[PDB]
Symmetry: D2
Subunit: 234 residues, 4 copies
C-alpha cells in the first residue's frame, strides 16, 4: 500500500510563455502496512520559489510552502471523507535536513549537497544548495528543483499524514517528469531519520532534453505554483 | 492570446483503485484580443458527480461545482497576484443551456443532446443528458463527462473571467485527454449565445482504448475532484 | 480479433533536422473472426512521397510504396512464423479508389476529396487530392499525408493479407499520431467495396500543435521512409 | 553532431498478446566532429533472443543479430542516400566485451556483470549475464534486454558506421523506454576500448511500472524482432 501523485507544473520562460511538464510520483513507505492510517484522495498546493542565486547557478537557495487539503467544495453526493486525523511524534515542529544528490542529465554528470530547515506542520522549508562536481551546469537548474521534501506538507484538514507517520523507518519516492518538448527526468529518493535530522538521498537521470530548447539553453525563470493530486493504491 | 489548461483527473474503478488521465486544453476566444482583460496564472477546483443514471447509461444527469482562485499561499517573492476585476453583463446569474454532441469512440458512432441550468457566478450547474443514437454505448459514460461549460466558474478574488467576458461572440475549446492505459479522447467544442441561452456544440473522437481494460468493460465509477491550472499564451 | 500497428515517422524540417511523431493504429475487421487467416508479428516498409503540389497546398498528389515482410534474419530459437499464404479475390490487380475526408486541426475546419489508382499486390498507389473547403490550410499538409490505404500492401513471403481478406464487408482503422513537440492527431476511417471501387471515409481531429512550431508555420518538407510493426490481439 | 534513434518493440506475454513500448535513444560520440563520417537516415532490423536462463533469471545468455540498411524501395524522387562507406581499423572481426551494470527498478536496487563475444561486421553477438546483487529480481528480466551493444551492427549497403568510427575515444548512449501500461525505464551507458576489449558501463533507472501488471508479475516471454530508425541531428 502506497500513495501515487500526479502534477502538471509550469516552467516560466525568458520572453513570456511556459513549458509544461507532467509528474507521475510513487510514494512508498518503509513502515509496515498494518500500522499506517491511509488517507483518501487529496490535493497539495505548493509554491516553489528561487530565493537566491550565485555562481552561474552552482549555488541556489530554494523556499517551498506546501499545503494539503480535501475538496472544500460541497458535494451533492456523500463523500464527506473527510475522515482524517494523524499524529506523528518523531517529527518536531522545527526540523533540520541534509541532502546528497548524484545523477546525469543528457550525458553530463554532476553532484549536489544541501542543508536546510523548515516547519513541517506549518508547511514551509528552505534549502541551501551546492553544486559540487560538474558545475557550471549546462542545463537550467530549475529541472532539479522538485528533487530536493514530503515531510513538510502541512496536513491541516486532519487528513492523515502518510509521510510523517512513516518515521523512523522512513519513506522513498520515485518520479518521472515528462516535459512536453521531449525531455524526461526520472529520480529516485530515500528519506530516513538519524539523530533527529532528515537525510535525503537522491539520484537523478534525465534524458532527451532538446539541445536547442529552453532547458539546455537556460532560458527559464522558475516555476509557477502547482497542485499535486495524491491517492492510495495496492 | 488564449488560455491553455492542464489537469490530471482520477477515474474511480470497480474494486477500488484508479485510472489516471491527462487533460491538455486550449481555450480560444471569439471576442478580439484588445477587448479582453487577460488573467494571470490561476487554478480551478472542480467536483463533477453523476446524480442520476437510467437505461444502461443512455440517460445521465450531471452536477458540477467549479471555483477559480489564485494561489492563496504567501509568496517569499513579490508575485502579489492578485490584479483582477472583471465584469461580464450578458451572463445573468441564472442561465439555461442546450447541447448537441456527435463523435466516435473506438469505431462506435453515437449522438447526444442535453439541456441544463446553473448559477455561473456561484460556480454550479446541472446537465440532463440523453443518448439519442447508438445506445447502449459499449463504453463507460464517464469518459464523456468532461465534454459537456466554462462559463459556470465562480471567479472570486477578482480574477478576470475569460469565458464570460467573451460574450456575445462566444468561445471554443479543444482538448486531448490522455489515459495512462492507452486511450486518447480529443474533443472540439463551440460555445455561443442565442436569445439568452447558452448553446454547446461538441465533437468527440476517441481511439485506442484497450478492449479488455476498465473503460470498455465499464468497470468505472465516476470521477474524483480535480484541479485545472489555467494559463495565458500567444 | 484484430491487428495493431506502431510506427515512428520523421518529418523533414526546413533547415535540416527532423520532428518525430508516433503512430498508434488499431485495424479492425468487418468480416467474421472464423473466416480470417490471422498473420503473426510482421513489418511494413513504406516510402511516402509528394509527387506534386499546386495552389498553396490545395492540390497534392501522393505516391506510396508499401512492402510487408517477416524478419529475414536468422533466429537462434525456433520462431519460424514463418507460416503464411493468403489469396484475396474481390481485389483485382488493378484497383481504383475514391475517398472523402472531413475534420479539424487546431480549430480550423476543412474537407478533402481524392481519387487514385494502384497495384495492391505490387504494393504501389497514387492519390490525387483536392482541398474543397477551408483552404488555404494554415498548417503543413504533411500532417494529413498518412490519412489518405491499407489494401495496397505487397504481402510477400506468404504473409496472410488481413486487409484483402476482409472483402466484401470491408475494414476500419483508427489511429493516434503523437508529435514530440505536442501536437496530437487522431483519425478514424472506414473502408468498403462497392462496384469494384474501394471507398474510403476518413475523419480527422488534431489538436495542440504549437503555434510557433513547424507544423503551423509550414516549415516542413515531407516524411522520411518508415517501418510499421503489425501484430494481432483480441 | 550525434545520432538519435527511435523504435517500437513488442513484448511477448504469457497467454499470447503483447505490451508495446517506445524507445527514444541519443547516441553521442567522444571522437571530435570533423573526423566522423555521418550517416544519413537509416534503419536497423534486430532480433534479440534469450538463449539460456537459469536460477530464476539470475543467469541469462543473450544473442543479437543487427543488420542496418537504407530504404531498399524505389523513390519517385531524387533521394538515393546512397553514399555510404566507412572503415574502422581498431575493431577486429572477433571482439570481446565486458560489462558492468547498476540501477533501480521500482525502488528495487541491483547490479549485473556480463561478458561476451561477437562479430561486429557480421552483426552478431552474445552476452552471458550474471545478476550479482539483489537477485532474484522481482521484475521481468526482459526490460533490461536492450541495455547490455552498438558496435556489433552489420552496416551493409555502405552506411557510414557511426559507432565503429568513434574508436578509440568511444561513444555514450542514453535512452528512455516507455511502456504503454505506464512503466518508464531510462538508461545511460558508456562504451570504451581498452587493450582490445570493449568495456561497457550501464546505469538503469526504471519507475512507475504497474504492480499488478506483466513486468512486475514476471508474465513475459521475450521480445519480437524490431526496427529502430536512426537519424543525425545538430
Ligand atoms: Mg493539476
Amino acid at each position: 500500500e502506497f500513495l501515487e501523485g500526479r502534477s502538471d507544473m509550469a516552467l516560466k520562460l525568458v520572453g513570456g510563455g511556459h513549458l509544461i511538464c507532467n509528474l507521475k510520483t510513487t510514494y512508498r513507505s518503509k513502515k509496515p502496512a498494518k500500522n499506517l492510517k491511509m488517507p483518501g484522495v487529496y490535493y497539495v498546493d505548493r509554491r516553489l520559489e528561487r530565493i537566491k542565486e550565485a555562481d552561474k547557478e552552482t549555488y541556489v537557495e530554494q523556499h517551498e510552502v506546501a499545503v494539503a487539503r480535501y475538496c472544500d467544495l460541497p458535494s451533492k453526493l456523500g463523500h464527506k471523507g473527510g475522515t482524517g486525523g494523524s499524529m506523528s511524534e518523531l517529527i518536531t515542529e522545527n526540523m533540520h535536513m541534509k541532502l546528497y544528490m548524484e545523477g546525469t542529465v543528457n550525458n553530463h554528470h554532476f553532484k549536489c549537497t544541501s542543508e536546510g530547515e523548515g516547519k513541517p506542520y506549518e508547511g514551509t522549508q528552505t534549502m541551501r544548495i551546492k553544486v559540487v562536481e560538474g558545475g557550471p551546469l549546462p542545463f537550467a537548474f530549475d529541472i532539479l528543483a522538485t528533487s530536493f521534501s514530503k515531510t513538510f506538507i502541512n496536513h491541516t484538514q486532519g487528513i492523515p499524514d502518510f509521510f510523517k507517520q512513516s518515521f523512523p523507518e522512513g519513506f522513498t519516492w520515485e518520479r518521472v517528469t515528462t516535459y512536453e518538448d521531449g525531455g524526461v527526468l526520472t529520480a529516485t529518493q530515500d528519506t530516513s531519520l538519524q539523530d533527529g535530522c532528515l537525510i535525503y538521498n537522491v539520484k537523478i537521470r534525465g534524458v532527451n532534453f532538446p539541445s536547442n530548447g529552453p532547458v539546455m539553453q537556460k532560458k527559464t525563470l522558475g516555476w509557477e505554483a502547482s497542485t499535486e493530486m495524491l491517492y492510495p493504491a495496492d
